[PDB]
């Protein structure tokens, strides 16, 4: 069905809204899983704007492909959680 990168594209607003408060922890979780490099993680951790921080993480992760996207979503949903109106 839906590719992880497509999930991120469709849920971009919700992810950006629900992940801001704990974006540091998310960065940490993703560094510890190899999804981010050290420099990537520093660059993102240093952004003072937490919304832009999440927005850029999402883009960075979409650019790395589907596995990276899955990893972000699995970490995301631990803090943010996972009707049929699209039909």
Residue numbers in the entry: 5 to 86, 91 to 95
Reproduce text from the manuscript describing this model.
To better understand the CARD domain-mediated inhibition mechanism of ARC during apoptosis signaling, we report the first crystal structure of the CARD domain of ARC containing amino acids 1–95 at a resolution of 2.4 Å. Interestingly, the sixth helix (H6) was not detected at the typical location, indicating that H6 might be flexible in the CARD domain of ARC or adopt a loop structure instead. There were two monomers in the asymmetric unit, chain A and chain B. The model of chain A was built from residue 5 to residue 87 and residue 91 to residue 93, while that of chain B was built from residue 5 to residue 84. The helix bundle from H1 to H5 was tightly packed by a central hydrophobic core composed of I12, V20, L23, L30, L31, L34, L35, L40, L48, V58, L61, L62, L64, V65, L76, and L77. The two ARC CARDs in the asymmetric unit are packed as an asymmetric dimer with an interface composed primarily of an electrostatic interaction. The principal interaction forces are salt bridges and hydrogen bonds, which are made by D13 (on H1), R56 (on H4), R59 (on H4), and R60 (H4) from chain A and by D32 (on H2), R37 (on H2), E46 (on H3), and D49 (on H3) from chain B. Although a unique disulfide bond-mediated homo-dimeric structure of the CARD domain including NOD1 and CARMA1 has been reported, the current structure of ARC CARD was dimerized via a Type I interface, which is a novel method for the homo-dimeric CARD structure. The size exclusion chromatography and MALS experiment showed that the dimeric ARC CARD became a monomer via mutations of interface residue D49R, R56E, and R59E, and double mutants.
ARC CARD interacts directly with the death domains (DD) of Fas and FADD, as well as with the death effector domains (DEDs) of procaspase-829.
